[PDB]
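In the previous chapter we treated chains in isolation. Here, by contrast, the input contains five separate entities that must be folded as one system, with a combined length of 1535 residues.
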Amino acid sequence: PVDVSVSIFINKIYGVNTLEQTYKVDGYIVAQWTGKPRKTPGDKPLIVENTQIERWINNGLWVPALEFINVVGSPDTGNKRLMLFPDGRVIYNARFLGSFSNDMDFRLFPFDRQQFVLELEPFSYNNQQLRFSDIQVYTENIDNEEIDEWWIRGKASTHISDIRYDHLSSVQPNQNEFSRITVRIDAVRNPSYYLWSFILPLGLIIAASWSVFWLESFSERLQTSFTLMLTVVAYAFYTSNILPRLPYTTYIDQMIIAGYGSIFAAILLIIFAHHRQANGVEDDLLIQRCRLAFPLGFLAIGCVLVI
Amino acid sequence: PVDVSVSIFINKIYGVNTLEQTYKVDGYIVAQWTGKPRKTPGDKPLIVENTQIERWINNGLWVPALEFINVVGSPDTGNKRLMLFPDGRVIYNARFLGSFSNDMDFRLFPFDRQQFVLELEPFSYNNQQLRFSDIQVYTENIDNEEIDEWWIRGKASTHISDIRYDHLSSVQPNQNEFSRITVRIDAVRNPSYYLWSFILPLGLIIAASWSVFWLESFSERLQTSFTLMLTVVAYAFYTSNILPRLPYTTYIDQMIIAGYGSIFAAILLIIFAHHRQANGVEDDLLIQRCRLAFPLGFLAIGCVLVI
Amino acid sequence: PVDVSVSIFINKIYGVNTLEQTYKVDGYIVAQWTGKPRKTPGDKPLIVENTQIERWINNGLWVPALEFINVVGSPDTGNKRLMLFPDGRVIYNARFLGSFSNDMDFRLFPFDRQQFVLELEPFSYNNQQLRFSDIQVYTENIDNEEIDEWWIRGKASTHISDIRYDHLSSVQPNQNEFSRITVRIDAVRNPSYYLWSFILPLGLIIAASWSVFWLESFSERLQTSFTLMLTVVAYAFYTSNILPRLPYTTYIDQMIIAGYGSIFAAILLIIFAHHRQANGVEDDLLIQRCRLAFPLGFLAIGCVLVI
Amino acid sequence: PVDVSVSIFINKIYGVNTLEQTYKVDGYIVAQWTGKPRKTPGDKPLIVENTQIERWINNGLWVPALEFINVVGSPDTGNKRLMLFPDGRVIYNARFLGSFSNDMDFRLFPFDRQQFVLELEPFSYNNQQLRFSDIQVYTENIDNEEIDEWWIRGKASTHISDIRYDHLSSVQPNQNEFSRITVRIDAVRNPSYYLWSFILPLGLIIAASWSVFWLESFSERLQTSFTLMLTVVAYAFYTSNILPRLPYTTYIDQMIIAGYGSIFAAILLIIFAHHRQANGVEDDLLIQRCRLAFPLGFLAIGCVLVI
Amino acid sequence: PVDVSVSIFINKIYGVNTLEQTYKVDGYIVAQWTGKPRKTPGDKPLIVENTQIERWINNGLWVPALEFINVVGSPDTGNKRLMLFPDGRVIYNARFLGSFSNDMDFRLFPFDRQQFVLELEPFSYNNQQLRFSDIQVYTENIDNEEIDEWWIRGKASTHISDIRYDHLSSVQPNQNEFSRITVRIDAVRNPSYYLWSFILPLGLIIAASWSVFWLESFSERLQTSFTLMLTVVAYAFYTSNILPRLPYTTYIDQMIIAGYGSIFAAILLIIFAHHRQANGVEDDLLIQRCRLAFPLGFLAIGCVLVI
């Protein structure tokens, strides 16, 4: 097996999509191995640019094809370069721009903490014919940066592992184990936009819904709380588009459901207060003194749900 | 006829679109056949990478073109590889990423059960010149997984069949029958998101519409039920985008139509109660005691429609 | 002139767009002509796959370039194939996927009947050098099918004609007449979705607008009819996106305009009833008995407009 | 300098975008020049198709690269063709599909009159080495047609000019003047859709806003005019998407601003009528008789603004 | 090191996206260096077009690959050209169309001032093997122009610097310093559209919210201010799409938050005025005379926030 020494340089991470859980990584990859010595013009290394690499692979040069496993589509490989040294070592440099995909988990949605993963692996040569020695990831252009809404926290974690493939067990009997490099970058979402845009107005609307009890009539109370029903209908539209159709519920939609429950509870309470008249004349003050009980109960429900 | 032994490895299924009934399958295809023996360097097999396969097909190697029938666009074939063995057998490995399309049926929409189909077929050689022996589908990366909102249920069903083509009956008189491989993966939708997002608030709004009868006036009742008309207008917008313009109706839109019918029935009932005054003085209590009759009738209508 | 015998096989029609009046046709094209005899390996026909056709056109083979006239962009030609027979005849098979465009007419919008047109024509050789003998269109995969919302009615109509081109009259003096094949498939829209989604709720809202006269006040009538003004404002949004900005009006927007006219007529009528008080005391009953006159007048207006 | 005689054939103009001020032109280009004589097979002209032109440019044929200046992206050149005549003249035919861009001016928006411009120019050879003799534009397929919403008015205006380039003044000292062809097609927008969709309902809503004065109360007037405030808020959404963020204002948004001013003027007038009570008892009839003054004043303001 | 003399000609800047902070630059690049002399046909310079450059790089010509660092995707290089002079100097001209990306800062959003940056750099040769002598940027086509909504202010600032790369420090020990050219163009946003579209109606709605105190009731005040709550909910939708989810807040959203605070303050004030009745009979005039205090306080809050 030949020892290849990868050195990825993340130039930028952008386009971080949460609907499809993809992101775009732009950067450089530098693989380096050693082979039989050769004679170059002079004793200085020879730089062979893009589309001149095919004039050398045709003549018998060995350049492996390192692919990215977790990519969506194919990478947009721009320039590429091959440095040939007289002492016998080859360096393959390339520029990649990929739409990578990782399994994201938005259980906590506004205060979410995710990681971006690049997986690199030879396409043809297993670990008996090509092994990765080491990786250095030079993530210095995004070291502590706000990319669009993510803080990139700390360094990048690098790992080299062996993967078993079973569809190649019928064509390669005992050597189908492929070397693989995994690079993980930890990112933390910036919750400020959702705090001042999706949580403060929901707080104001729910507080206004609490204040419907201070009217001294009935039909005016019903009409006002139905208007607030319509208003909290609007926020389902306003928050639908930012996230995927997840089977679980996040914090933002837990407040939406709590707002629906509060509106419906207030309407049902004033309806039952209208029907509490056993003789048609009895006034209700114990159930209408929920002006201190309903906000405290909502705070307790919100606290037990958030805890 | 030469016997080709396909072995598809589904790496992932994603991007499952219901508006256009397409999905994206990313994976590997491994075809294997046998030919005349040859001399390789040594006695070890020879790996010929991408764009070096054309230097061999030009010299006279026989590599068939296996296409995907149900694809939208063309597959984004990334790397490809050709293993040539000294004993005479050839193995063609390729990586495919396709936007496939199948005929989906959303009669039941939130509890829907669908299947994803890959169809593979030679482009040029009929079953007198190329036959498929067997297929093993290695769907172990999506075996029991929630891809975005689908459970993948169990194994993958594989089939090999013969297809008649009639536009080639004028150019190939008696041999136009093409071998074909069909792979079906059964997926079950996850109804949780529609349960807590599109059914619970419609239930609350329809219950609030039931509670309009407990007012003791007339014009307040009319204004309140028209506000609820507007609110259920909003949910047509809110549910329009998730599905294709189907000629039939699903469960979600059956509840939308039931909500429209309930609002209009309540408005028409209170209008007829206002016009039931034969002398201008007669009060109505039998038709205004539908506070127990309207929810039970709605439950019976919903139950007979759902059954 | 050489006689080419085209045989198109429509595999599917999908993506039928009405905003841009394009559609996507996926299928196969099989052209067949005869030339000088040749020696193949044995006496069996020779199949030359994709990218091996260029090794034959370089050596002097004659393969014409048949283009599609009404295409948007360029076709996504996938595989292609060339069958060379020892008796001297050549067969060029190709797989095409095109975004074609035809002049659609949505005068009647929900009950619309359109046709999908494929036009095929040589790029370089006029009818003195290349003539089309016949076409057989094998539309058996979409024969009577609901593609997304269109019934495909019956067979496909095929035509072969000659087209004059006048920009080539300065470079080809008397022979600029190009052969052309036109294929027309008749499709009929499925009006069910618009019936139960865009016409039933507009009917309910217009009926509720008719029922505003049964109030016995004035300001309540004005506020209610302005709420219904807002509701029919919403349907302009709800129906804007499904169709192109046409200079004429369809059935759906004729109902939108009729709803606007009904709301404004009711508001103007109750305003004039408020101002009919010549002494400030005279009550109006003849103009307020339009509870039977307004729905009948709306039905007559709708019937004369639809007829 | 060699004399090239271009002959553009506009096949269709479509996709006319106003947000980005681009449009798509599909058609053919035919350039023709004369060179040294040559021997062809026989004495008939030789047709060299796509990808066979490179076998001739490698051997020393001179084919200039005519580019389009005002294009967005690169043209999607489909087929191309080269006719070589024994008398010594060459004809280069190509099919182009370009997203062209022109500086549009929507000062008058619904009754707008624009022109579509194609600019063609050699890439390498200045007018000392390549001159354009003439252009004939064969715009007969779009001569008087409604493309999507534009009438194409009359013929196409053709011009041949010389352009100075100053970045090539440091590499070409005295000859950097490039020949150029400009083709202008005049199109007139079809205002019918905006008349019956964006102007008639704004007229109805503004008329209903005029009719708020005929109420005989105060708070009902305030609530009604605030509902109409909300309704004219909706039309900002409804008209935002059809046009670019222009620094000036068009006719449609001038009516939106006039509607906002009318609603606010009516609200401020009834507020000042409520506060005109110097003793708390004085009734106002001169300022409340604006039921004839407000519509006439709005008509005068609209007329002076439109004139 | 060889001295390359770049000369960029910005043809246009368009497509300026603020959601993703990218923009599209279309133009020409002209690099020029000197080498060993050569014999051309005659003594006139030799123009080698696109795809004929590969016939010269194969024979041993030295053409460096200048890449753009801050690009998204890869540039859409259209035509390219190579001028070879007998005195020994080479000129490489190319046409580029790139989606470039720069770090934008929308702290002030409507009156924003940004700059568009092009960064150009050799891919393979460091500054010991390739140095940039100078750059002239010919930005005369966008000199003082309104591109879509940006004024381009003045000339373009050009800079040539040296960049250290550390992933190449393991393969190039002491010479990994790459020459680089940065071009900055200063653009100023045109605030007119946001002034007459997003600030004038928010001013009108906030003024109408100030005018809720002039009612002489309580429940009518509450219902009116809740309607204005709904109206300012709509503008969060109306302004969400124009900008990225920034952690800070701009001017437009500061007015949105001020409108929410004003509505909630008015509602809470009238609620506390209803509960100021210590005996159930005491009328409030000092707290209800905020008709002059609330607008002045809002003006002071807006002024201290804007300053």
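Chains A and C do not touch (no CB pair under 8 Å). Residues 251-274 of chain A form the longest helix (24 residues). Compare these points with the single-chain example from earlier in the chapter.
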